[PDB]
Design a protein around this ligand. Structure first.
Ligand SMILES: NC(=O)c1ccc[n+]([C@@H]2O[C@H](COP(=O)([O-])OP(=O)(O)OC[C@H]3O[C@@H](n4cnc5c(N)ncnc54)[C@H](OP(=O)(O)O)[C@@H]3O)[C@@H](O)[C@H]2O)c1
Ligand SMILES: NC(=O)c1ccc[n+]([C@@H]2O[C@H](COP(=O)([O-])OP(=O)(O)OC[C@H]3O[C@@H](n4cnc5c(N)ncnc54)[C@H](OP(=O)(O)O)[C@@H]3O)[C@@H](O)[C@H]2O)c1
Ligand SMILES: O=C1NC(=O)c2c1c1c3ccccc3[nH]c1c1[nH]c3ccccc3c21
Ligand SMILES: O=C1NC(=O)c2c1c1c3ccccc3[nH]c1c1[nH]c3ccccc3c21
Ligand SMILES: [Cl-]
Ligand SMILES: [Cl-]
Ligand SMILES: [Cl-]
Ligand SMILES: [Cl-]
Ligand SMILES: [Cl-]
Ligand SMILES: [Cl-]
Ligand SMILES: [Cl-]
Ligand SMILES: [Cl-]
Ligand SMILES: [Cl-]
Lengths: 290, 289
């Protein structure tokens, strides 16, 4: 209602965007950066810049960290172990699951409530609708800080294991690249010469956007299959995937679209049909990649 | 209460007839083999014994047969009877099949729309599922209200062969998505810090994330059409760096899908060509002729 105290450590492009969003939401925002001179614009927006990380940590019960690497996080935070007792550390630095876990354990050993997070947008998306920030670790920290963290974007609490956010980021990027590479293949197929072709990317994508709703139905149908280890094919079996994948491969070859995607798909589905699972759903393929 | 005829009562054709009945249309049906129309007749369809009678029954003739060869076996004897009627052909087939059937329909004075059904029989008549049409704009505009019974109709344009190509391109998009999804499920489910997460828990998050992925597709389509691919805050350099992270993480957690290697090789070629500051859309130049 009236604003909370929050500190941001790190004024690179992303940390500066975080601080700006906290300020725009009315929070009393204290900032620090290792190198002087990157906080003048934020000071005019109401931030208080301080010269040391120690002063910045002492300023707020909620310390948001956004630095280049976890090596940098530990260089900044390790000398402040005693100063962090009783505070909440929200670490939005990118890095590995094991580094998230090791930082969490260190914070616990020094009495800081630790929440690791990943930012699923670029600096211009901070503070805008739909963009996600994903958090994992202390549920006390998440519930107590959610109202402030909302300033940055939509928060999602993944669970209690601090390493989860790192893994989600990686898995979600893989899903994005699969989608975008299938999208590119489709754009190229639609744009090529030939009967039915010479369609713009924009026209294709108007239809593709509608189709993604159906693709989402498939993902939500198949997630319980994976979790159950039971993959009923019902009206769309691996036999049918493999047949229509070969049609895609043929159409792509005729129209000069060479992405490697049809080959990856037919090899994978072929292995599962060879193994006897042609009547199963696409979810059965999880057993052929894990 | 529009009059509509369905030729073909296989699993899909029977579902289309069921959906026309559910929307209140006066639905006449025919199938080569007798005995597949009893449930539809119970729901108010008129089953007739010959394709000629079925074509004579309605100004709108919806065809859904196994192959385009089957379409011509049924319709070629009826060429004089099709003049002035609208033929909507939802049979699957090649772009050439669609174009040749459209040319034949034109010669005989039938208005011809070729389509593709972007769902299985259980999705027919339900929200969100698409049917895509291409060919006669007069046919589409005049029949759209009736065709709404089957699913959401979209008019792709005037070239009858477009629907076939769109189906192939949209399936490729579905498979890229589902394979990235499977890869992510396997990463999340693996042993290791932050792992042992169910597919259902991962997909709840992924559903939200797909809104951002849609933002990217909409940003990048105009790049392709302009031939200009400004990378802004997420360039190919950054894609390649984080793809290498995906590849390493996947190796450590035992996930072997081929996807990370495909991605790094593709982005690597664009970076070697000096496009590291561009958007993902630049990669269209590295898969197309
Ligand atoms: N920008 C994005 O689009 C984006 C999106 C998602 C996640 N992220 C994550 O956000 C974090 C910050 O990204 P960024 O774009 O702002 O820039 P970045 O270049 O990754 O990090 C720059 C920040 O790190 C500080 N830093 C680096 N090494 C340090 C050290 N040894 N000790 C103290 N401070 C150190 C820099 O301080 P100096 O100014 O003194 O060098 C600066 O504040 C990264 O982990 C990134 O992966 C960024
Ligand atoms: N089912 C789906 O999930 C689905 C999804 C998308 C698209 N489609 C497309 O919809 C069309 C129909 O699919 P379907 O699932 O109903 O099964 P289908 O096995 O492809 O076709 C069965 C229909 O074709 C008829 N037929 C086959 N050869 C014929 C011929 N020479 N002369 C006259 N009729 C002939 C069959 O008649 P009889 O009963 O006399 O044998 C039956 O009515 C196909 O092109 C399919 O690719 C289907
Ligand atoms: O460095 C980065 N700059 C970014 O923009 C970024 C970065 C990383 C990253 C760096 C090291 C290890 C794992 C990582 N994951 C990342 C990201 N995931 C996103 C999802 C949406 C929008 C932007 C990003 C994004
Ligand atoms: O035969 C098929 N049975 C199907 O279900 C199906 C079929 C074909 C097909 C056959 C020959 C040539 C091209 C083709 N494209 C197809 C499909 N695209 C879809 C999108 C969503 C749900 C189902 C489908 C689907
Ligand atoms: Cl200062
Ligand atoms: Cl590091
Ligand atoms: Cl932990
Ligand atoms: Cl042409
Ligand atoms: Cl949409
Ligand atoms: Cl009869
Ligand atoms: Cl054929
Ligand atoms: Cl573990
Ligand atoms: Cl959602």
């Amino acid at each position: 209602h009236m604003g909370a105290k929050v500190t941001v450590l790190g004024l690179g492009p992303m940390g500066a965007a975080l601080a700006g969003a906290f300020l725009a939401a009315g929070h009393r925002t204290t900032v620090w950066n290792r190198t002087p001179g990157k906080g003048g614009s934020l000071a005019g927006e109401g931030a208080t810049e301080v010269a040391s990380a120690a002063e910045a940590v002492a300023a707020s019960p909620l310390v948001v960290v956004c630095l280049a690497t976890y090596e940098a996080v530990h260089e900044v935070l390790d000398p402040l172990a005693d100063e962090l007792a009783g505070r909440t550390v929200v670490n939005l630095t990118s890095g590995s699951p094991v580094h998230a876990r090791e930082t969490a354990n260190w914070a616990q050993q020094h009495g800081a409530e630790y929440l690791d997070g990943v930012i699923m947008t670029t600096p211009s998306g901070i503070g805008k609708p739909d963009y996600l920030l994903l958090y994992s670790g202390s549920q006390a920290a998440f519930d107590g800080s959610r109202g402030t963290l909302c300033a940055l974007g939509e928060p999602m609490n993944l669970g209690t294991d601090a390493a989860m956010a790192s893994v989600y980021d990686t898995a979600l990027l893989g899903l994005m690249w699969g989608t975008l590479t299938g999208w590119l293949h489709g754009v190229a197929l639609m744009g090529a010469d030939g009967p039915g072709g010479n369609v713009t990317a924009t026209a294709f994508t108007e239809v593709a956007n509608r189709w993604m709703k159906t693709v989402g139905v498939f993902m939500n149908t198949y997630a319980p299959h994976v979790d159950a280890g039971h993959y009923p094919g019902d009206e769309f079996t691996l036999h049918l995937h493999h047949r229509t994948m070969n049609i895609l491969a043929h159409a792509s070859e005729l129209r000069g679209v060479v992405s490697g995607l049809p080959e990856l798909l037919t090899e994978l589905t072929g292995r599962a049909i060879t193994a006897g699972h042609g009547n199963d759903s696409y979810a059965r393929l999880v057993e052929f990649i894990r």
